[model samples]
Target: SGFRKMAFPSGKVEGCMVQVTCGTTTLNGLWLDDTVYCPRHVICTAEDMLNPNYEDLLIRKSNHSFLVQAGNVQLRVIGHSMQNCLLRLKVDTSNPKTPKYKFVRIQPGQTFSVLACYNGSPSGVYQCAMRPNHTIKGSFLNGSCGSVGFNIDYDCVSFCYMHHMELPTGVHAGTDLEGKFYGPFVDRQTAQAAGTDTTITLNVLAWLYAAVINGDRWFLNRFTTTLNDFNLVAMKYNYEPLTQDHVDILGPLSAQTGIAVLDMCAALKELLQNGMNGRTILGSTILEDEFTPFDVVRQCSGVTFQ
Candidate 1:
């Protein structure tokens, strides 16, 4: 006979069964062998993970002062790793020998702003400092600390002084014209003395003469013109040369400055070349047996020519 049915009776079993029904005819059977069942599940423990630590946060400080020329002074304090941290700003004015510090506080990862009005008297150095909470003391954080200096004052007055006008050729009126004129004259004389021939001496003397005469004239014309123009403009607007001190300020020609001595040598050369002969030109006259060499003229003038 063929196997007719299968059964499981030793263990609890749960499964679906397939059935075929024809015209209400039915058959039911259990497994002939015992079947066992096992269930699937998962487990987890709390000790395997790490918790958040406070040692990872940090803090620092920086300079926060407004360098301004007007009404109010303000400073800012910045904090980092400061998520809920406290910061302080301090202004120290107690010490008379050194600059003082001003203080204030800020919360974690935040900026503290402070403002103070300056009464034009309080002008000096200012500094800023910051600190983080103890929780993040050892960890890496952000921010820096420092100080800066500032100044406050009114705009300076704009006024022209008479002393500025006193300058000679290159100096103002009331300036020491003697000192100014002496140097160039001396230089010319020295150059003329070193010059060996009439040509060289004349060239050297010409430079010296031009420096004293033309140089001084140029200086005077420029100075007086500037002063006159300035005075005219002020007078048109009902103002004067800032100060009447300019009135007594001396003019350039009044200095009585001599032309560069080298110019005299050059003049002599021209006179001689034109057949104008004299004791001065020959360094001696026909009446005098001693001849005054042309080189003597150059030596006396202190000129050097190529």
Candidate 2:
């Protein structure tokens, strides 16, 4: 497998510089549009990998195994459930800081319930307010919960949840629109009659962002598949995708026009206060104009929408 070369319009042909060794002669090459073009005939090759991160993790096997053996790999694992999977650590009174925990080791060919994972170092081991001093640790395997592996799993859920959006129920339904959809449908007539303001779009985007930050993934594939179809339709129509500039220009709304926006803002604020780490969501590999509902919201952390 090879990377696609940069295919740009005239005067926009930018690419990476590559050096190739053709027999005894060393020739300079340009890597563009997934191909390496050399002055002389040269073959460019790359391995096709579905899971590149896992492959990278394989490359760093030694370092990762070493960290796992040290009992300080610093992994945070959460399972498929909506609630956080709190794996308790077995207490070792001798040294309270590094207590031993019986983490369930993951097997090689078996899938686990893990939904999210991250690199973490416990800040505090005890809670004066509570009687039981237990650490909220999740389970992992020596091979499974490597630093990169943790990132991979967390990214998987974040990506899925980021794409899945549940639109608010269609309001002010009037006239027999051609589509006549059951849920969240708006034709040009109904849309314009609703208002000139883009409150609906902005609020929907905000809700999607809040859900993603809250780590809420639709376990069923139907949701993501439907969203994929929706995105495909947009692409087919060449509908201009929203961008940061669009959000900045349209997001400011009065209390009357942006009731949903205010509610989503409140929800987002609550989620952030409750340890919703959306910073990871910002790192997704979403292409430009491919998914901008998230494009706008992924940049939001607290109440500020940047």
Candidate 3:
């Protein structure tokens, strides 16, 4: 009755005008979380929660590509491309250093920083715990990729938010995947920071919407195939890059095409360019008399999305 439901996190919606400032993750998690874009798709893998043993092997062979400087923290990560990366404290030579907390209670009129954390364990084998804040009270764990913002912010849209590892505190923070959530633990859709912070704020509705779409393998697959189609759309349109018009034309087509169909298309751009042809690309179809990928490319050759 409220938000539509899917089973997974869909990246972002089309023509929604996203702004990704959260850099890349330590592993091939998704390059928009912490606030950086990785140079290469090297490892191209996020930590596999199902494969615990495969981790240390990654560490030994990685370039350790993650680094950031903000406030009292300068996070160092492993691998220009690798997974199950182990991170250490640039601030603490001491083990189990004091835990850091980013608390938020968005109400009235408010805007502030929200930092995220990654529990860098290979399997679900790590854990992290925090000291209770006697200075304040209430739950610290609220939102992560698990959500979005308030209904009041419907005007704001969203994509799945990025998350990363919380810096270590002394010998604590589950450096060995021994902490509470089994890694550098962090929580709350609200962590305050200054100067540097991941800035892609999500709307409450969009957040829930993404979770559902992202989880649905069938739906998510179609969505991605739709995006991949645009690359080919770009190539055919003879545009140097994909632009607003490309997004607008495809957005409506992408919408109607969302209904489950008897016939569907799914392929990354290179594959279609290299080996795919004569496929029905638009319309909810089983019959072969619908829009082909090329048709859409030329059809919306002049429109643009806001």
Candidate 4:
């Protein structure tokens, strides 16, 4: 049987189920005029109407991440932003009756510039609406049949990209905390540049960490603790040059077991030697884990923010 369900415009739903089946299995279906399409499995009860808040449901269901590029800046997108971006790319920006979609997950480290946003291509010219909450609402331009793309109303920090800010030119290894998630952001050009350096300096290790383990909280914590200790020492001596005692205290950190840990420690020492005594560092860093879209918008400069 087919049944009609009511969905509110303000992110809420009230629904009742009808008997449905799919190849011998019981399932709920959607009603369209004169036909029934069995699609979803019943989640709760058989025949009673269910009322649910759509926004809450979407929030609970949406946890996604993707590495996407907007012009010269590539972003690590997480949570609801990923869903919105994908939808904008596929639906909101395309010709309604004749839309073409293509999604390619470029292997990590490969160049994405080859995918041009030319007419008739799956890659359309992109724009971002950076909302006040830092949610990036991506849109497409110069699409088929002169489609101008979707319209966004409010809760945005910047409606124009590139003119707003310039994204950091190089990878600055670190994770940005957003709500309950923390993830990495990186710049491939800087990471590749550092990797190609032939110097014997521990900068390579720092680059390696930025490019590889920047998302590992375990490694990050250890590195942060040791750096903080050195910072404390520098402050303790009235900002004088760190003495042998400081080196002695730092030496034990290098002795910690594990190859990755040692590599990180060695880089930390090099950073200290280079007077990179700040609590956080910029340069040769990459995002290796879960990060939100807003974090990218704030750190990345290409998009203007309000």
How does residue 297 of candidate 2 score in lDDT? Answer: 38
TM-score of 3: 0.18
Give the per-residue lDDT of model 4 (tens digit) for 216-269. Answer: 223233343354554454344233233344344323222332234444544444
Which candidate comes out best when scored by TM-score?
4
Give candidate 4 misplaced runs (Cα > 4 Å). 1-116, 120-206, 209-227, 230-263, 275-306
Residues 70-187, candidate 3: write the lDDT tens digits.
2234444432332133222122112122222221222211121112222211111111111111011111231222111111123332221222222222121111111113222332
Count clashing residue pairs per candidate: 50, 7, 41, 15
Against the reference, the lDDT scores of all candidates come to 0.19, 0.24, 0.25, 0.24
- lDDT for model 4 comes to 0.24
Given candidate 1, what's the lDDT at residue 101?
A: 20
Worst 10 residues of 4 by lDDT: 7-16
Model 3: CA > 4 A from native? 1-49, 61-63, 71-86, 89-306
Off by over 4 Å in 2: 1-259, 277-291, 294-306
lDDT, candidate 4, residue 160?
A: 15
Q: How would you encode candidate 1's per-residue C-alpha lDDT over 51-95 as one tens digit per residue? A: 312123111112232111111322122211211111112222111
lDDT score, residue 169, model 1? 25
Model 2 scores worst on lDDT over the 10 consecutive residues at: 126-135
Best by lDDT: 3
Candidate 2 per-residue C-alpha lDDT over 105-157 given as tens digits, one digit per residue, 9 for 90 to 100: 22111111222112221111110100011111223222111111110121221
Q: What's the TM-score of each model vs. the native?
A: 0.12, 0.16, 0.18, 0.20
